[PDB]
Design a protein around this motif. Structure first.
Motif, PDB file in Angstrom:
ATOM      1  N   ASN A   1       0.822  -1.175   0.000  1.00 25.42           N
ATOM      2  CA  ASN A   1       0.000   0.000   0.000  1.00 25.42           C
ATOM      3  C   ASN A   1       0.869   1.242   0.000  1.00 25.42           C
ATOM      4  OD1 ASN A   1      -3.157   0.416   0.490  1.00 25.42           O
ATOM      5  ND2 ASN A   1      -2.618  -1.737   0.843  1.00 25.42           N
ATOM      6  N   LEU A   2       1.956   1.123   0.764  1.00 21.29           N
ATOM      7  CA  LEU A   2       2.920   2.194   0.841  1.00 21.29           C
ATOM      8  C   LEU A   2       3.477   2.478  -0.563  1.00 21.29           C
ATOM      9  CD1 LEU A   2       5.535   3.758   2.314  1.00 21.29           C
ATOM     10  CD2 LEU A   2       6.569   1.591   1.931  1.00 21.29           C
ATOM     11  N   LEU A   3       4.036   1.447  -1.157  1.00 23.04           N
ATOM     12  CA  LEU A   3       4.585   1.513  -2.478  1.00 23.04           C
ATOM     13  C   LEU A   3       3.610   2.076  -3.519  1.00 23.04           C
ATOM     14  CD1 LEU A   3       7.056   0.715  -1.889  1.00 23.04           C
ATOM     15  CD2 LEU A   3       6.822  -1.606  -2.741  1.00 23.04           C
ATOM     16  N   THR A   4       2.428   1.488  -3.556  1.00 19.17           N
ATOM     17  CA  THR A   4       1.480   1.903  -4.545  1.00 19.17           C
ATOM     18  C   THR A   4       1.249   3.370  -4.485  1.00 19.17           C
ATOM     19  OG1 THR A   4       0.511  -0.163  -4.741  1.00 19.17           O
ATOM     20  CG2 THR A   4      -0.631   1.729  -5.555  1.00 19.17           C
TER      21      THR A   4
ATOM     22  N   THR B   1       0.382  -0.491 -11.030  1.00 18.72           N
ATOM     23  CA  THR B   1      -0.615  -1.440 -11.466  1.00 18.72           C
ATOM     24  C   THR B   1      -0.523  -2.843 -10.860  1.00 18.72           C
ATOM     25  OG1 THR B   1       0.934  -1.564 -13.276  1.00 18.72           O
ATOM     26  CG2 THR B   1      -0.885  -0.002 -13.518  1.00 18.72           C
ATOM     27  N   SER B   2       0.684  -3.395 -10.801  1.00 23.74           N
ATOM     28  CA  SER B   2       0.828  -4.734 -10.264  1.00 23.74           C
ATOM     29  C   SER B   2      -0.024  -5.007  -9.052  1.00 23.74           C
ATOM     30  CB  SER B   2       2.163  -5.440 -10.346  1.00 23.74           C
ATOM     31  OG  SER B   2       2.017  -6.505 -11.346  1.00 23.74           O
ATOM     32  N   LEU B   3      -0.532  -6.221  -8.950  1.00 22.46           N
ATOM     33  CA  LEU B   3      -1.416  -6.659  -7.870  1.00 22.46           C
ATOM     34  C   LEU B   3      -0.698  -7.267  -6.685  1.00 22.46           C
ATOM     35  CD1 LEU B   3      -3.800  -5.454  -8.811  1.00 22.46           C
ATOM     36  CD2 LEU B   3      -3.405  -7.153 -10.625  1.00 22.46           C
TER      37      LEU B   3
ATOM     38  N   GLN C   1       5.080  -4.991  -8.095  1.00 23.95           N
ATOM     39  CA  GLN C   1       5.002  -3.597  -7.727  1.00 23.95           C
ATOM     40  C   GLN C   1       6.369  -2.985  -7.558  1.00 23.95           C
ATOM     41  OE1 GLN C   1       2.235  -2.135  -7.948  1.00 23.95           O
ATOM     42  NE2 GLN C   1       3.402  -0.221  -7.517  1.00 23.95           N
ATOM     43  N   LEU C   2       7.210  -3.769  -6.925  1.00 21.88           N
ATOM     44  CA  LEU C   2       8.547  -3.365  -6.635  1.00 21.88           C
ATOM     45  C   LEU C   2       9.369  -3.309  -7.894  1.00 21.88           C
ATOM     46  CD1 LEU C   2       9.228  -4.339  -3.235  1.00 21.88           C
ATOM     47  CD2 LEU C   2      11.253  -3.761  -4.451  1.00 21.88           C
ATOM     48  N   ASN C   3       9.201  -4.334  -8.718  1.00 24.15           N
ATOM     49  CA  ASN C   3       9.919  -4.418  -9.965  1.00 24.15           C
ATOM     50  C   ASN C   3       9.547  -3.260 -10.859  1.00 24.15           C
ATOM     51  OD1 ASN C   3       9.473  -8.048 -10.090  1.00 24.15           O
ATOM     52  ND2 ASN C   3      11.016  -6.794  -9.054  1.00 24.15           N
TER      53      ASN C   3
ATOM     54  N   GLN D   1      10.919   0.169  -9.591  1.00 21.14           N
ATOM     55  CA  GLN D   1      12.363   0.164  -9.822  1.00 21.14           C
ATOM     56  C   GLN D   1      12.778   0.395 -11.251  1.00 21.14           C
ATOM     57  OE1 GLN D   1      14.923  -2.360  -6.867  1.00 21.14           O
ATOM     58  NE2 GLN D   1      15.373  -2.732  -9.072  1.00 21.14           N
ATOM     59  N   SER D   2      11.939  -0.081 -12.143  1.00 19.04           N
ATOM     60  CA  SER D   2      12.211   0.065 -13.539  1.00 19.04           C
ATOM     61  C   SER D   2      11.814   1.453 -13.963  1.00 19.04           C
ATOM     62  CB  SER D   2      11.539  -1.047 -14.345  1.00 19.04           C
ATOM     63  OG  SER D   2      10.582  -0.533 -15.253  1.00 19.04           O
ATOM     64  N   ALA D   3      10.596   1.822 -13.574  1.00 15.92           N
ATOM     65  CA  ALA D   3      10.098   3.126 -13.896  1.00 15.92           C
ATOM     66  C   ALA D   3      11.136   4.171 -13.514  1.00 15.92           C
ATOM     67  CB  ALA D   3       8.740   3.327 -13.252  1.00 15.92           C
ATOM     68  N   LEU D   4      11.680   4.053 -12.304  1.00 14.60           N
ATOM     69  CA  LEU D   4      12.677   4.981 -11.828  1.00 14.60           C
ATOM     70  C   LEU D   4      13.897   5.004 -12.710  1.00 14.60           C
ATOM     71  CD1 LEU D   4      12.762   4.606  -7.961  1.00 14.60           C
ATOM     72  CD2 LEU D   4      11.961   6.582  -9.161  1.00 14.60           C
TER      73      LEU D   4
END
Length: 153
Positions: free
Chosen positions: A34-37, A85-87, A92-94, A97-100
């Motif tokens: 939830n934090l990540l999202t 988006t990931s569930l 989510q983490l991946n 990390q990529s987006a960044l």
């Protein structure tokens, strides 16, 4: 100048990404998710802001700079759209990390371009690029501050 900005961005991003991994030390595999999202969404929000303001700038110039400027923006937008988006925590983490990582690379690309223009073609949109670089740096520092404060309490 942009070079600098962009260099500072990179460092920022690199670190922020390191920390992403510590989200796994959180109480629940839910809390973290939830934090990540959330964070991902905050970032995405900011990067899209930049994209929009640079698109606007492009509208004021002529030639291939404008073309290329508009392009860059579009691209920045593409590397973030689908990042929260990931569930599951993992994806989510991946995703983040990529987006960044993609935002940083795209910043380097455009920086180098401007630098390689001996005719100083990019000069005219330098302020805009710079401000945008700063806004991206902040988004990434903010994110980091969060992953940090949620791992100290």
């Amino acid at each position: 100048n942009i070079a600098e900005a962009v260099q500072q961005l990179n460092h920022t991003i690199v670190n922020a990404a390191h920390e992403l991994h510590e989200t796994l030390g959180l109480p629940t595999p839910d809390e973290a998710l939830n934090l990540l999202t959330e964070q991902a969404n905050a970032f995405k929000t900011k990067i899209a802001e930049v994209t929009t303001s640079l698109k606007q700038e492009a509208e004021k110039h002529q030639g291939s700079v404008a073309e290329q400027l508009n392009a860059f923006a579009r691209n920045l937008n593409n590397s973030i759209h689908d990042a929260a988006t990931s569930l599951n925590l993992q994806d989510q983490l991946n995703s983040l990390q990529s987006a960044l990582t993609n935002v940083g690379h795209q910043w380097q690309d455009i920086a180098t371009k401007t630098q390689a223009s001996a005719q100083e073609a990019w000069a005219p949109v330098q302020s805009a690029l710079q401000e945008a670089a700063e806004k991206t740096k902040e988004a990434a520092a903010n994110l980091q501050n969060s992953i940090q404060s949620a791992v100290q309490k």
